Amino acid sequence: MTKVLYITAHPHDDTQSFSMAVGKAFIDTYKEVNPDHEVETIDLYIEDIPHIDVDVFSGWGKLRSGQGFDQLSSDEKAKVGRLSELCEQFVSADKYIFVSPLWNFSFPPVLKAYIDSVAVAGKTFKYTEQGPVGLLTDKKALHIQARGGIYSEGPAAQMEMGHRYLSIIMQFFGVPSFDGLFVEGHNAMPDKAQEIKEKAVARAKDLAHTF
Amino acid sequence: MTKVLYITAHPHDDTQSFSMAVGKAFIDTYKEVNPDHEVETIDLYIEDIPHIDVDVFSGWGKLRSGQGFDQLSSDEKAKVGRLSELCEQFVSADKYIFVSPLWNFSFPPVLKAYIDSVAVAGKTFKYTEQGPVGLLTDKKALHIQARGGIYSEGPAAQMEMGHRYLSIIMQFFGVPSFDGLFVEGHNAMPDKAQEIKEKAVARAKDLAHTF
Numbered sequence A, B: 001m002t003k004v005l006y007i008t009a010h011p012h013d014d015t016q017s018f019s020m021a022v023g024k025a026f027i028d029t030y031k032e033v034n035p036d037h038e039v040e041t042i043d044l045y046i047e048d049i050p051h052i053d054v055d056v057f058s059g060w061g062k063l064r065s066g067q068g069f070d071q072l073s074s075d076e077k078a079k080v081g082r083l084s085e086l087c088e089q090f091v092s093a094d095k096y097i098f099v100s101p102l103w104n105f106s107f108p109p110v111l112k113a114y115i116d117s118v119a120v121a122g123k124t125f126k127y128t129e130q131g132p133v134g135l136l137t138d139k140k141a142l143h144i145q146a147r148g149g150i151y152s153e154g155p156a157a158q159m160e161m162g163h164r165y166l167s168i169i170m171q172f173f174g175v176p177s178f179d180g181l182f183v184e185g186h187n188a189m190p191d192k193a194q195e196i197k198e199k200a201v202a203r204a205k206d207l208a209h210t211f
Protein backbone atom coordinates (compact mmCIF):
# COMPACT_ATOMS: atom_id res chain seq x y z
CA MET A 1 0.00 0.00 0.00
CA THR A 2 2.83 2.46 -1.10
CA LYS A 3 2.32 5.73 0.88
CA VAL A 4 3.67 9.12 -0.38
CA LEU A 5 4.05 12.23 1.87
CA TYR A 6 3.59 15.51 -0.13
CA ILE A 7 5.20 18.13 2.17
CA THR A 8 4.66 21.80 1.13
CA ALA A 9 6.55 24.74 2.69
CA HIS A 10 4.78 27.71 1.01
CA PRO A 11 2.55 30.45 2.44
CA HIS A 12 -0.97 30.94 0.92
CA ASP A 13 -0.47 34.37 -0.71
CA ASP A 14 -1.84 36.21 -3.83
CA THR A 15 1.57 35.87 -5.62
CA GLN A 16 1.76 32.84 -8.02
CA SER A 17 4.15 30.08 -6.75
CA PHE A 18 6.43 28.37 -9.34
CA SER A 19 7.34 25.58 -6.78
CA MET A 20 3.62 24.79 -6.06
CA ALA A 21 2.79 24.71 -9.84
CA VAL A 22 5.64 22.17 -10.52
CA GLY A 23 4.67 20.26 -7.36
CA LYS A 24 1.00 20.08 -8.43
CA ALA A 25 1.99 18.84 -11.95
CA PHE A 26 4.31 16.22 -10.33
CA ILE A 27 1.79 14.95 -7.76
CA ASP A 28 -1.28 14.96 -10.10
CA THR A 29 0.66 12.93 -12.78
CA TYR A 30 2.04 10.60 -10.02
CA LYS A 31 -1.48 9.64 -8.81
CA GLU A 32 -2.68 9.13 -12.46
CA VAL A 33 0.39 6.83 -12.99
CA ASN A 34 -0.07 5.08 -9.57
CA PRO A 35 -3.83 5.10 -8.75
CA ASP A 36 -3.43 2.55 -5.85
CA HIS A 37 -0.75 4.69 -4.05
CA GLU A 38 -1.84 6.66 -0.95
CA VAL A 39 -0.74 10.35 -1.19
CA GLU A 40 -0.97 12.23 2.13
CA THR A 41 -0.42 16.01 2.15
CA ILE A 42 1.25 17.93 4.94
CA ASP A 43 0.89 21.66 4.35
CA LEU A 44 3.37 23.22 6.83
CA TYR A 45 1.47 26.61 6.65
CA ILE A 46 -1.86 24.93 7.70
CA GLU A 47 -0.62 22.32 10.24
CA ASP A 48 0.76 23.23 13.70
CA ILE A 49 4.52 22.42 13.94
CA PRO A 50 5.60 22.74 17.62
CA HIS A 51 8.42 25.14 18.65
CA ILE A 52 11.35 23.41 20.38
CA ASP A 53 11.43 24.56 24.05
CA VAL A 54 13.60 23.28 26.98
CA ASP A 55 10.91 20.67 27.96
CA VAL A 56 10.17 18.64 24.73
CA PHE A 57 13.66 17.02 24.17
CA SER A 58 15.99 15.65 26.93
CA GLY A 59 18.76 15.66 24.23
CA TRP A 60 19.42 15.18 20.48
CA GLY A 61 16.50 13.11 19.02
CA LYS A 62 15.28 12.20 22.56
CA LEU A 63 11.59 12.95 23.06
CA ARG A 64 10.74 13.58 26.77
CA SER A 65 9.11 10.42 28.25
CA GLY A 66 10.77 10.11 31.77
CA GLN A 67 10.24 11.76 35.23
CA GLY A 68 10.62 15.26 33.54
CA PHE A 69 7.78 14.33 31.12
CA ASP A 70 5.42 13.46 34.06
CA GLN A 71 6.31 16.90 35.60
CA LEU A 72 5.09 18.57 32.32
CA SER A 73 1.77 20.47 32.03
CA SER A 74 -0.93 18.78 29.87
CA ASP A 75 0.03 21.60 27.36
CA GLU A 76 3.70 20.47 27.16
CA LYS A 77 2.67 16.73 27.07
CA ALA A 78 0.33 17.68 24.14
CA LYS A 79 3.35 19.34 22.40
CA VAL A 80 5.47 16.13 22.89
CA GLY A 81 2.56 13.99 21.54
CA ARG A 82 2.34 16.27 18.45
CA LEU A 83 6.11 15.87 17.73
CA SER A 84 5.59 12.08 18.17
CA GLU A 85 2.65 12.24 15.71
CA LEU A 86 4.69 14.26 13.09
CA CYS A 87 7.61 11.80 13.34
CA GLU A 88 5.30 8.67 13.17
CA GLN A 89 3.53 10.04 10.02
CA PHE A 90 7.01 10.70 8.46
CA VAL A 91 8.50 7.17 9.19
CA SER A 92 5.18 5.52 8.04
CA ALA A 93 5.55 6.83 4.39
CA ASP A 94 7.62 5.08 1.65
CA LYS A 95 8.35 8.31 -0.35
CA TYR A 96 8.87 11.99 0.59
CA ILE A 97 8.12 14.97 -1.67
CA PHE A 98 9.37 18.36 -0.38
CA VAL A 99 8.13 21.54 -2.16
CA SER A 100 9.81 24.85 -1.28
CA PRO A 101 10.77 28.31 -2.48
CA LEU A 102 14.38 29.49 -2.33
CA TRP A 103 14.46 32.35 0.28
CA ASN A 104 17.91 33.90 0.95
CA PHE A 105 19.69 30.70 -0.37
CA SER A 106 17.53 28.44 1.87
CA PHE A 107 13.91 27.47 2.64
CA PRO A 108 11.10 28.87 4.80
CA PRO A 109 11.74 28.56 8.58
CA VAL A 110 8.84 26.10 9.08
CA LEU A 111 10.63 23.42 6.98
CA LYS A 112 13.49 23.58 9.54
CA ALA A 113 10.84 23.26 12.37
CA TYR A 114 9.43 20.23 10.50
CA ILE A 115 12.92 18.58 10.18
CA ASP A 116 13.44 19.24 13.95
CA SER A 117 10.10 17.44 14.64
CA VAL A 118 10.91 14.25 12.66
CA ALA A 119 14.67 13.90 13.58
CA VAL A 120 14.06 11.39 16.46
CA ALA A 121 16.44 8.66 17.76
CA GLY A 122 14.92 5.14 17.28
CA LYS A 123 12.64 6.60 14.52
CA THR A 124 14.69 8.25 11.68
CA PHE A 125 18.22 7.65 13.12
CA LYS A 126 19.77 5.53 15.92
CA TYR A 127 22.94 5.83 18.04
CA THR A 128 25.55 3.12 17.26
CA GLU A 129 29.09 2.39 18.48
CA GLN A 130 30.31 4.26 15.31
CA GLY A 131 27.88 7.24 15.87
CA PRO A 132 24.42 8.16 14.42
CA VAL A 133 23.08 5.85 11.63
CA GLY A 134 19.86 6.46 9.63
CA LEU A 135 16.96 3.99 9.80
CA LEU A 136 15.12 5.05 6.62
CA THR A 137 17.22 2.70 4.45
CA ASP A 138 14.27 1.69 2.12
CA LYS A 139 12.71 5.18 1.44
CA LYS A 140 13.24 7.68 -1.40
CA ALA A 141 12.79 11.47 -1.48
CA LEU A 142 12.34 14.34 -3.99
CA HIS A 143 12.74 18.10 -3.52
CA ILE A 144 10.87 20.44 -5.92
CA GLN A 145 12.42 23.90 -5.44
CA ALA A 146 11.84 27.25 -7.22
CA ARG A 147 14.79 29.75 -7.42
CA GLY A 148 14.59 33.31 -8.86
CA GLY A 149 18.18 33.11 -10.30
CA ILE A 150 20.38 30.22 -11.62
CA TYR A 151 21.95 27.95 -8.92
CA SER A 152 22.67 24.79 -11.04
CA GLU A 153 26.01 26.28 -12.31
CA GLY A 154 28.41 29.25 -11.89
CA PRO A 155 29.52 30.97 -8.64
CA ALA A 156 25.93 30.92 -7.29
CA ALA A 157 25.82 27.06 -7.11
CA GLN A 158 28.20 27.21 -4.07
CA MET A 159 25.73 29.56 -2.24
CA GLU A 160 22.65 27.24 -2.45
CA MET A 161 21.95 25.92 1.11
CA GLY A 162 18.26 24.74 1.07
CA HIS A 163 18.59 21.68 -1.20
CA ARG A 164 22.10 21.13 0.28
CA TYR A 165 20.70 20.96 3.89
CA LEU A 166 17.83 18.64 2.82
CA SER A 167 20.49 16.43 1.10
CA ILE A 168 22.48 16.29 4.43
CA ILE A 169 19.27 15.30 6.40
CA MET A 170 18.30 12.61 3.85
CA GLN A 171 21.91 11.26 4.16
CA PHE A 172 21.70 11.39 8.01
CA PHE A 173 18.29 9.53 7.88
CA GLY A 174 19.96 6.98 5.49
CA VAL A 175 17.53 7.70 2.64
CA PRO A 176 19.46 6.13 -0.28
CA SER A 177 17.69 8.08 -3.15
CA PHE A 178 17.22 11.93 -3.11
CA ASP A 179 16.04 13.61 -6.39
CA GLY A 180 16.15 17.42 -7.06
CA LEU A 181 13.72 19.06 -9.53
CA PHE A 182 14.46 22.78 -9.96
CA VAL A 183 12.49 25.60 -11.65
CA GLU A 184 15.04 28.42 -11.79
CA GLY A 185 16.07 31.73 -13.42
CA HIS A 186 12.52 33.07 -14.06
CA ASN A 187 13.17 36.27 -11.91
CA ALA A 188 16.55 36.87 -13.70
CA MET A 189 14.94 36.45 -17.20
CA PRO A 190 11.22 37.19 -16.69
CA ASP A 191 10.81 37.22 -20.52
CA LYS A 192 11.54 33.43 -20.30
CA ALA A 193 9.44 32.73 -17.13
CA GLN A 194 6.61 30.85 -18.98
CA GLU A 195 9.13 28.75 -21.01
CA ILE A 196 11.15 27.98 -17.81
CA LYS A 197 7.90 27.00 -15.97
CA GLU A 198 6.60 24.78 -18.88
CA LYS A 199 9.99 23.01 -19.12
CA ALA A 200 10.03 22.27 -15.30
CA VAL A 201 6.35 21.02 -15.46
CA ALA A 202 7.33 18.64 -18.35
CA ARG A 203 10.35 17.42 -16.30
CA ALA A 204 8.01 16.97 -13.26
CA LYS A 205 5.55 14.93 -15.42
CA ASP A 206 8.51 12.77 -16.69
CA LEU A 207 9.79 12.11 -13.12
CA ALA A 208 6.19 11.21 -11.98
CA HIS A 209 6.33 8.20 -14.42
CA THR A 210 9.49 6.69 -12.74
CA PHE A 211 9.35 7.96 -9.09
CA MET B 1 29.71 55.60 18.87
CA THR B 2 30.49 51.93 17.95
CA LYS B 3 27.28 49.81 18.06
CA VAL B 4 27.28 46.00 18.64
CA LEU B 5 24.23 43.74 18.06
CA TYR B 6 24.07 40.71 20.37
CA ILE B 7 21.65 38.34 18.54
CA THR B 8 20.60 35.23 20.55
CA ALA B 9 18.64 32.27 19.09
CA HIS B 10 18.10 30.17 22.29
CA PRO B 11 14.87 28.97 24.00
CA HIS B 12 14.39 30.49 27.53
CA ASP B 13 14.62 28.64 30.94
CA ASP B 14 17.68 26.61 29.80
CA THR B 15 19.67 26.53 33.10
CA GLN B 16 22.52 24.71 31.22
CA SER B 17 22.97 26.45 27.81
CA PHE B 18 26.59 26.11 26.56
CA SER B 19 26.18 28.62 23.66
CA MET B 20 24.61 31.23 26.04
CA ALA B 21 27.38 30.61 28.67
CA VAL B 22 30.16 31.40 26.12
CA GLY B 23 27.98 34.22 24.73
CA LYS B 24 27.67 35.69 28.29
CA ALA B 25 31.48 35.42 28.77
CA PHE B 26 32.29 37.00 25.36
CA ILE B 27 29.86 39.98 25.72
CA ASP B 28 30.50 40.69 29.46
CA THR B 29 34.30 40.91 28.83
CA TYR B 30 33.61 42.90 25.59
CA LYS B 31 31.59 45.57 27.50
CA GLU B 32 34.35 45.82 30.26
CA VAL B 33 37.13 46.14 27.56
CA ASN B 34 34.99 48.64 25.51
CA PRO B 35 32.79 50.44 28.12
CA ASP B 36 32.16 53.30 25.57
CA HIS B 37 30.57 50.86 22.97
CA GLU B 38 26.75 50.56 22.73
CA VAL B 39 25.68 46.84 22.86
CA GLU B 40 22.03 46.30 21.75
CA THR B 41 20.50 42.84 22.46
CA ILE B 42 17.97 41.13 20.22
CA ASP B 43 16.62 37.96 21.79
CA LEU B 44 14.82 36.14 18.94
CA TYR B 45 12.72 34.27 21.61
CA ILE B 46 11.52 37.63 23.01
CA GLU B 47 10.98 39.84 19.94
CA ASP B 48 8.41 39.07 17.21
CA ILE B 49 9.94 38.18 13.87
CA PRO B 50 7.26 38.48 11.15
CA HIS B 51 6.33 35.39 9.02
CA ILE B 52 7.23 36.15 5.36
CA ASP B 53 4.12 36.90 3.25
CA VAL B 54 5.41 37.01 -0.39
CA ASP B 55 2.71 39.69 -1.15
CA VAL B 56 4.71 42.29 0.89
CA PHE B 57 7.74 41.88 -1.49
CA SER B 58 7.80 43.04 -5.18
CA GLY B 59 10.92 40.82 -5.75
CA TRP B 60 13.84 39.37 -3.72
CA GLY B 61 14.69 41.86 -0.90
CA LYS B 62 12.29 44.51 -2.22
CA LEU B 63 9.71 45.65 0.38
CA ARG B 64 6.56 47.02 -1.34
CA SER B 65 6.56 50.88 -1.58
CA GLY B 66 4.26 53.54 -3.12
CA GLN B 67 1.08 52.13 -4.78
CA GLY B 68 2.32 48.52 -4.21
CA PHE B 69 2.41 49.26 -0.43
CA ASP B 70 -0.85 51.33 -0.44
CA GLN B 71 -2.89 48.34 -1.84
CA LEU B 72 -1.79 45.95 1.00
CA SER B 73 -3.98 44.60 3.84
CA SER B 74 -3.59 46.39 7.28
CA ASP B 75 -1.77 43.27 8.63
CA GLU B 76 0.53 43.33 5.54
CA LYS B 77 1.31 47.08 6.00
CA ALA B 78 2.22 46.36 9.68
CA LYS B 79 4.53 43.50 8.59
CA VAL B 80 6.38 45.72 6.11
CA GLY B 81 6.83 48.21 9.02
CA ARG B 82 8.25 45.49 11.32
CA LEU B 83 10.59 44.06 8.64
CA SER B 84 11.81 47.64 7.84
CA GLU B 85 12.36 48.22 11.65
CA LEU B 86 14.43 44.94 11.98
CA CYS B 87 16.44 45.72 8.84
CA GLU B 88 17.19 49.34 9.99
CA GLN B 89 18.39 48.05 13.42
CA PHE B 90 20.69 45.48 11.69
CA VAL B 91 22.15 48.14 9.27
CA SER B 92 22.66 50.64 12.19
CA ALA B 93 25.17 48.24 13.91
CA ASP B 94 29.01 48.09 13.33
CA LYS B 95 29.44 44.56 14.73
CA TYR B 96 27.22 41.43 14.81
CA ILE B 97 27.45 38.57 17.33
CA PHE B 98 25.16 35.55 16.66
CA VAL B 99 24.68 32.97 19.49
CA SER B 100 23.03 29.63 18.51
CA PRO B 101 22.78 25.94 19.36
CA LEU B 102 23.41 23.33 16.66
CA TRP B 103 20.03 21.62 16.02
CA ASN B 104 20.12 18.87 13.35
CA PHE B 105 23.33 20.31 11.77
CA SER B 106 21.79 23.87 11.64
CA PHE B 107 20.21 26.56 13.91
CA PRO B 108 16.77 27.27 15.40
CA PRO B 109 14.17 28.20 12.74
CA VAL B 110 13.69 31.72 14.17
CA LEU B 111 17.29 32.61 13.15
CA LYS B 112 16.27 31.82 9.48
CA ALA B 113 13.20 34.10 10.00
CA TYR B 114 15.56 36.84 11.33
CA ILE B 115 17.89 36.57 8.27
CA ASP B 116 14.78 36.76 6.00
CA SER B 117 13.84 39.98 7.92
CA VAL B 118 17.17 41.80 7.36
CA ALA B 119 17.97 40.65 3.73
CA VAL B 120 16.57 43.85 2.07
CA ALA B 121 17.61 45.52 -1.22
CA GLY B 122 18.92 49.08 -0.62
CA LYS B 123 19.81 48.13 3.02
CA THR B 124 22.02 44.96 3.33
CA PHE B 125 22.54 44.26 -0.45
CA LYS B 126 21.85 46.09 -3.73
CA TYR B 127 21.42 44.98 -7.35
CA THR B 128 23.99 46.04 -10.02
CA GLU B 129 24.72 44.82 -13.62
CA GLN B 130 26.04 41.49 -12.17
CA GLY B 131 23.04 40.95 -9.81
CA PRO B 132 23.14 41.25 -5.99
CA VAL B 133 26.24 42.67 -4.20
CA GLY B 134 26.57 43.22 -0.43
CA LEU B 135 26.31 46.75 1.10
CA LEU B 136 27.78 45.98 4.56
CA THR B 137 31.42 46.46 3.41
CA ASP B 138 32.58 48.22 6.71
CA LYS B 139 31.35 45.74 9.31
CA LYS B 140 32.46 42.68 11.35
CA ALA B 141 30.67 39.51 12.61
CA LEU B 142 31.09 36.58 15.07
CA HIS B 143 29.11 33.31 15.51
CA ILE B 144 29.18 31.73 19.02
CA GLN B 145 27.81 28.17 18.41
CA ALA B 146 27.39 25.15 20.83
CA ARG B 147 27.63 21.67 19.11
CA GLY B 148 26.97 18.32 20.93
CA GLY B 149 29.52 16.56 18.69
CA ILE B 150 32.78 17.41 16.84
CA TYR B 151 32.31 19.39 13.55
CA SER B 152 35.73 21.27 13.41
CA GLU B 153 37.42 18.18 11.73
CA GLY B 154 36.65 14.84 9.98
CA PRO B 155 33.65 13.75 7.80
CA ALA B 156 31.17 15.47 10.23
CA ALA B 157 32.71 18.94 9.42
CA GLN B 158 31.12 18.53 5.97
CA MET B 159 27.59 18.01 7.49
CA GLU B 160 27.68 21.29 9.53
CA MET B 161 25.15 23.68 7.85
CA GLY B 162 24.28 26.45 10.42
CA HIS B 163 27.66 28.23 10.61
CA ARG B 164 28.13 27.47 6.88
CA TYR B 165 24.81 29.28 6.08
CA LEU B 166 25.60 32.36 8.27
CA SER B 167 28.99 32.42 6.46
CA ILE B 168 27.15 32.55 3.05
CA ILE B 169 24.78 35.36 4.30
CA MET B 170 27.67 37.45 5.72
CA GLN B 171 29.50 36.96 2.35
CA PHE B 172 26.21 37.94 0.53
CA PHE B 173 25.84 41.13 2.66
CA GLY B 174 29.56 41.89 1.89
CA VAL B 175 30.69 41.58 5.59
CA PRO B 176 34.45 41.19 4.94
CA SER B 177 35.21 39.51 8.36
CA PHE B 178 33.31 36.58 9.94
CA ASP B 179 34.74 34.55 12.90
CA GLY B 180 33.34 31.33 14.47
CA LEU B 181 33.82 30.52 18.20
CA PHE B 182 32.72 26.91 18.95
CA VAL B 183 31.97 24.90 22.14
CA GLU B 184 31.80 21.28 20.88
CA GLY B 185 32.00 17.66 22.19
CA HIS B 186 30.45 18.08 25.70
CA ASN B 187 27.67 15.67 24.52
CA ALA B 188 30.14 13.07 23.10
CA MET B 189 32.05 13.37 26.53
CA PRO B 190 29.56 14.26 29.31
CA ASP B 191 32.26 14.15 32.07
CA LYS B 192 34.56 16.52 29.98
CA ALA B 193 31.59 19.00 29.66
CA GLN B 194 32.58 21.38 32.54
CA GLU B 195 36.18 21.32 31.09
CA ILE B 196 35.17 21.99 27.41
CA LYS B 197 32.86 24.87 28.54
CA GLU B 198 35.76 26.47 30.56
CA LYS B 199 38.16 26.18 27.53
CA ALA B 200 35.57 27.90 25.25
CA VAL B 201 34.72 30.50 28.02
CA ALA B 202 38.50 31.19 28.21
CA ARG B 203 38.76 31.62 24.38
CA ALA B 204 35.65 33.94 24.56
CA LYS B 205 37.20 36.39 27.14
CA ASP B 206 40.40 36.26 24.92
CA LEU B 207 38.61 37.23 21.64
CA ALA B 208 36.58 39.95 23.50
CA HIS B 209 39.94 41.81 24.08
CA THR B 210 40.57 42.14 20.27
CA PHE B 211 37.09 42.08 18.52
Ligand SMILES: Cc1cc2nc3c(=O)[nH]c(=O)nc-3n(C[C@H](O)[C@H](O)[C@H](O)COP(=O)(O)O)c2cc1C
Pocket (backbone or CB within 6 Å): A010, A016, A017, A018, A019, A020, A100, A101, A102, A103, A104, A105, A106, A146, A147, A148, A149, A150, A187, B052, B054, B057, B059, B060, B061, B116
Ligand atom coordinates in the same frame (compact mmCIF):
# COMPACT_ATOMS: atom_id res chain seq x y z
C1 LIG C 1 11.71 36.19 0.89
C2 LIG C 1 12.30 35.91 -0.43
C3 LIG C 1 13.64 35.53 -0.52
C4 LIG C 1 14.17 35.21 -1.77
N1 LIG C 1 15.49 34.82 -1.85
C5 LIG C 1 15.96 34.50 -3.07
C6 LIG C 1 17.35 34.07 -3.23
O1 LIG C 1 18.02 33.84 -2.21
N2 LIG C 1 17.83 33.85 -4.46
C7 LIG C 1 17.08 34.04 -5.58
O2 LIG C 1 17.56 33.85 -6.73
N3 LIG C 1 15.77 34.41 -5.50
C8 LIG C 1 15.22 34.68 -4.30
N4 LIG C 1 13.90 35.05 -4.24
C9 LIG C 1 13.16 35.00 -5.47
C10 LIG C 1 12.53 33.54 -5.33
O3 LIG C 1 13.44 32.39 -5.18
C11 LIG C 1 11.57 33.10 -6.45
O4 LIG C 1 10.53 34.10 -6.52
C12 LIG C 1 10.98 31.67 -6.42
O5 LIG C 1 10.10 31.46 -7.56
C13 LIG C 1 10.18 31.41 -5.14
O6 LIG C 1 9.36 30.24 -5.23
P1 LIG C 1 7.77 30.33 -5.47
O7 LIG C 1 7.60 30.92 -6.83
O8 LIG C 1 7.40 28.90 -5.36
O9 LIG C 1 7.25 31.28 -4.39
C14 LIG C 1 13.36 35.34 -2.96
C15 LIG C 1 12.03 35.73 -2.84
C16 LIG C 1 11.47 36.05 -1.61
C17 LIG C 1 10.02 36.45 -1.59
Ligand SMILES: Cc1cc2nc3c(=O)[nH]c(=O)nc-3n(C[C@H](O)[C@H](O)[C@H](O)COP(=O)(O)O)c2cc1C
Pocket (backbone or CB within 6 Å): A052, A057, A059, A060, A061, A116, B010, B014, B016, B017, B018, B019, B020, B100, B101, B102, B103, B104, B105, B106, B146, B147, B148, B149, B150, B187
Ligand atom coordinates in the same frame (compact mmCIF):
# COMPACT_ATOMS: atom_id res chain seq x y z
C1 LIG D 1 16.76 19.78 18.95
C2 LIG D 1 18.20 19.42 19.08
C3 LIG D 1 18.95 19.09 17.96
C4 LIG D 1 20.31 18.75 18.08
N1 LIG D 1 21.03 18.45 17.00
C5 LIG D 1 22.35 18.16 17.10
C6 LIG D 1 23.19 17.85 15.96
O1 LIG D 1 22.78 17.91 14.77
N2 LIG D 1 24.46 17.50 16.16
C7 LIG D 1 24.98 17.42 17.37
O2 LIG D 1 26.18 17.12 17.44
N3 LIG D 1 24.28 17.71 18.50
C8 LIG D 1 22.99 18.07 18.41
N4 LIG D 1 22.28 18.35 19.52
C9 LIG D 1 22.99 18.41 20.77
C10 LIG D 1 23.25 19.98 20.91
O3 LIG D 1 23.99 20.62 19.81
C11 LIG D 1 23.99 20.41 22.18
O4 LIG D 1 23.12 20.18 23.30
C12 LIG D 1 24.33 21.91 22.18
O5 LIG D 1 25.04 22.19 23.39
C13 LIG D 1 23.16 22.88 22.17
O6 LIG D 1 23.50 24.22 22.57
P1 LIG D 1 23.02 24.82 23.96
O7 LIG D 1 23.90 23.99 24.90
O8 LIG D 1 23.36 26.26 24.02
O9 LIG D 1 21.58 24.53 24.22
C14 LIG D 1 20.93 18.69 19.43
C15 LIG D 1 20.16 19.01 20.54
C16 LIG D 1 18.82 19.38 20.43
C17 LIG D 1 18.00 19.69 21.65
